[PDB]
Amino acid sequence: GVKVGDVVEVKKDGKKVVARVVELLHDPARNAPVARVRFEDGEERLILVP
């Protein structure tokens, strides 16, 4: 149920940190939503939506 602008916790360099959801995509292979998240410093990452 994660949507654009929401905030989630992920690991970055062994530390639990907050990232902001900037985009919702879909992985046809895993048949599951994927979110483009952006960290405080501007780094981005793709994460499978829990």
Residue numbers in the entry: 3 to 52
Q: What does the study report here?
A:
Here, we study fold transition between distinct β-barrels by protein engineering and structural biology technique. Here, we discover that the previously reconstructed ancient DPBB sequence could also adopt a β-barrel fold named Double-Zeta β-barrel (DZBB), as a metamorphic protein. The DZBB fold is not found in any modern protein, although its structure shares similarities with RIFT and OB. Furthermore, the reconstructed OB fold could also be converted to the four-stranded SH3 fold by a simple circular permutation. Thus, these ancient β-barrel folds (DPBB, RIFT, OB, and SH3) could be readily interconverted by a few feasible mutations through the missing-link fold, DZBB, indicating their significantly close evolutionary relationships.
Given the high similarity between the OB and SH3 folds, they are presumed to have evolved from a common ancestral protein. Loren Williams’ group suggested that the four-stranded core fold of OB could have transformed to SH3 by a simple circular permutation (or vice versa). Following this evolutionary hypothesis, we tried to convert the reconstructed OB proteins to the SH3 fold. While design-23 had a random-coil structure, design-24 exhibited a CD spectrum for a folded protein and remained almost intact even at 90 °C. We also determined its crystal structure and confirmed that design-24 adopted the four-stranded SH3 fold. This experimental conversion from OB to SH3 strongly supports the previous hypothesis that these folds could have emerged by a simple permutation of their four-stranded core fold. In contrast, the reconstructed OB and SH3 proteins did not interact significantly with any oligonucleotides.
